[PDB]
C-alpha cells in the first residue's frame, strides 16, 4: 500500500493517479475504479477537466491493407467532470483518494467509477505477424482530458490515457467433478458403444496438467481405430452480431484400438500452454496492458441467469474425447460412426495476495 501508479499528459498539465491497474470482478461486485487527477494551473488554461472510463472493442478491418491500423468501438462509457467540482454533488472519498490529496493538495481532484457487472473482462486476441498495432480484443481505459465542453474536440497533448484491466480469479470451492458419458447405437444390433470420461477436478490453473479418465465399452461389430483427446477453447463474441469459435489448445491423438466386444480404460494427460499455439491468430488471451505475453484466457465466470448475450469475448473450456470408429457396415463410408463426449472445466489463476505486474521480468 506504499506505491501508486501515475501517468502524465504530454504537456504535464494533467496527471492521473491510481492505486491499481487490475480491478476484480467478483461476479456480484466488481471493485470500483478510484483515483485522482492532478491539475497544474501553471499550464492549465482549458476551463474544465473530465475523466472518462471506457470499455471498448478493438479490431482491425479485414479488407484493409493498412498495417498497425485498428478501430475501437465502445461498449461502456462513463463520464465524470472532475475539474472543477460541480456542487449538487457530495460524495465521500476512499482511503486511497484521502491519502492522495494529503499527498498532493487540493489540486488533486478525485474521480470514482463503478463498473456495472455483466460487462466483459479484459481479453486480447493473439496477433499474427501481420498485426503490428495495438492488441485487439476488449480493453479498459481511463482517460483524463481538459476541454471546454464535452462537444469540443479535445487535444492529444491535453489528455492522458491509461489502460486498466477487469479480471477474475478462481472460486474458492471447486465445482463437482467433471463427468460425461454417451451411448451410441447402430442400425442392426442395438448392442451399444458406450463412452465414459471424467476429469480429475473441475478447476485448473494455467500451466497445470489435466488428466482425463477414459472408459469405453464396445459391444458392437465396429472397432475404434483411434482416440482423440483435446482441450478446446470456446469463445463467444458479441458486438453487432454474435460469433463463435472452438479452438483446440492441446491435443493427443493416441493409436489406442478397441476391438469388438471389448473394453478399454486409459488415463491421458494434457497441458494447455501458449508455446505450441503461437500460430493460432485470434486465439483468446488474458488482457494485455501493452504488448507483453499473457496466458491462454481464463474462463469467464458469469452470474447464473438468462442468457443476456453478453457483449465482449466470453471464454470457456471443455475437454473433448472422440473415438474414431471404422466404417464398414451397410452404409460404406457415406456416414460417420464416431462417438464423442465433452467435459467442461474451469481454467483460471488462483486468488493472489499481491497484484499482477505490467511486465514480469523485462529485457
Amino acid at each position, epitope marked *: 500500500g*506504499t*506505491r501508486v501508479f501515475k501517468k502524465a499528459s504530454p504537456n504535464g498539465k494533467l496527471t492521473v493517479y491510481l492505486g491499481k491497474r487490475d480491478f476484480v470482478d467478483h461476479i456480484d461486485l466488481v471493485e470500483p475504479v478510484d483515483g485522482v487527477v492532478l491539475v497544474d494551473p501553471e499550464y492549465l488554461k482549458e476551463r474544465r477537466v473530465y475523466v472518462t472510463l471506457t470499455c471498448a472493442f478493438r479490431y482491425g478491418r479485414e479488407d484493409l491493407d493498412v498495417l498497425g491500423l485498428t478501430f475501437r468501438k465502445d461498449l461502456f462509457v462513463a463520464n465524470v467532470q472532475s475539474f472543477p467540482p460541480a456542487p449538487e454533488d457530495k460524495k465521500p472519498l476512499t482511503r486511497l483518494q484521502e491519502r492522495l490529496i494529503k499527498k498532493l493538495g487540493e489540486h488533486a481532484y478525485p474521480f470514482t467509477f463503478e463498473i456495472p457487472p455483466n460487462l466483459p473482462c479484459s481479453v486480447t486476441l493473439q496477433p499474427g505477424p501481420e498485426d503490428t498495432g495495438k492488441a485487439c480484443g476488449v480493453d479498459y481505459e481511463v482517460k483524463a482530458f481538459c476541454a471546454e465542453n464535452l462537444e469540443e474536440k479535445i487535444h492529444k497533448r491535453n489528455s492522458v490515457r491509461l489502460v486498466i484491466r477487469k479480471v477474475q480469479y478462481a472460486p474458492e470451492r471447486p465445482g463437482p467433478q467433471p463427468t460425461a458419458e454417451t451411448t451410441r447405437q447402430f442400425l442392426m444390433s442395438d448392442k451399444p458403444l458406450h463412452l465414459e470420461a471424467s476429469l480429475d477436478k473441475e478447476i485448473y*490453473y*494455467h*500451466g*497445470e*496438467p489435466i488428466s482425463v479418465n477414459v472408459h469405453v465399452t464396445n459391444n458392437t461389430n465396429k472397432t475404434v481405430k483411434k482416440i482423440k483427446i483435446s482441450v478446446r477453447q470456446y469463445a463467444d463474441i458479441c458486438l453487432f452480431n454474435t460469433a463463435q469459435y472452438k479452438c483446440p489448445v492441446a491435443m493427443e491423438e493416441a493409436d489406442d484400438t478397441v476391438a469388438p466386444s471389448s473394453t478399454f480404460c486409459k488415463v491421458y494427460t494434457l*497441458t494447455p*500452454f*501458449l*508455446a*505450441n499455439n*503461437r500460430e493460432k491468430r485470434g486465439l483468446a488471451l488474458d488482457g494485455k496492458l501493452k504488448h507483453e*505475453d499473457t*496466458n491462454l484466457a481464463s474462463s469467464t465466470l458469469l452470474r447464473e441467469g438468462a442468457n443476456r448475450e453478453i457483449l465482449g469475448i466470453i471464454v470457456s473450456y471443455k475437454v473433448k474425447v472422440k473415438l474414431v470408429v471404422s466404417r464398414g457396415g451397410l452404409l460404406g463410408d457415406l456416414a460417420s460412426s464416431d462417438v464423442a463426449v465433452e467435459l467442461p472445466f474451469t481454467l483460471m*489463476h488462483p486468488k493472489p*495476495k*499481491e497484484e*499482477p*505486474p505490467h511486465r*514480469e*521480468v*523485462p*529485457e
Partner: antibody
Amino acid sequence: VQLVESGGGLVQPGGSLRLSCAASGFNVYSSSIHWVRQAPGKGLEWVASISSYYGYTYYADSVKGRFTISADTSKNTAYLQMNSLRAEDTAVYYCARSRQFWYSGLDYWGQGTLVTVSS
Amino acid sequence: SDIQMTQSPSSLSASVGDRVTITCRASQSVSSAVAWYQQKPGKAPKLLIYSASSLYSGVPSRFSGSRSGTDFTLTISSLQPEDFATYYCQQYKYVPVTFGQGTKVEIKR
C-alpha cells in the same frame, strides 16, 4: 518437492559439460526454471532461465554463445549445456525453481552440483 | 547497464534477541521486485521475502522487508539462533536479475 541436480565434475579448459536438474513435485508449465552459480566465497550469479509455457530462454550476457538451457518436459528435467568452459566458470551451479504466474523470487533451490574447470 | 544491488553493511555482529537491519541500494528504481534470501554455509539458499515486503509462506514473522525508493531494507526484530547466516537482496525487475554481495550476520560473544 525436489530439484536434484546432476552432471557436475572436473573438465579441462575449453571442454564441455551438461547439468541435469530433475524436478519433482510441481508442474513445469507453471514454473520457470533457472541456473544460479556460486563461485566459492563470492556470492550469486544468475546464468540462465527457461520458461516452457511461453517457449523462451534467457542468458546472462557473460554466458551467451557457450551455454544453452533446455527442457524435456516429459522427463520433467532441465539441462544446461556448457561449452568453452573458462576457469572463471568454476562454481557451484544451483538449479532453482520460480513461479510462472508470476515470478516472486526463486522459491526453491537445488542442493547444487560442483563444476571445476582446470588444466 | 546491469542493476547493481549494493548491500550494507558487508558484515555485522549482534547477539540473540536484538533488532537488526540490513540494507540494499539499487543503481536505479526496481519498483518493488526485490527478494531476500538466507543461506547458511554449505547449503542451498532459501527464500524469505519477495515483492520487497511480502513474507514468504513458512518464514517466521520476525522478518520484515520494506522499501524507500531505491533503498530496500530487511530487518529481524527478535534475533534468534536459527537466524545466523548470510543474507542477499535481489532485484528481479530487469534481466538479468542481480543479487547483492551478502551481509555476514555473526553472533556477538
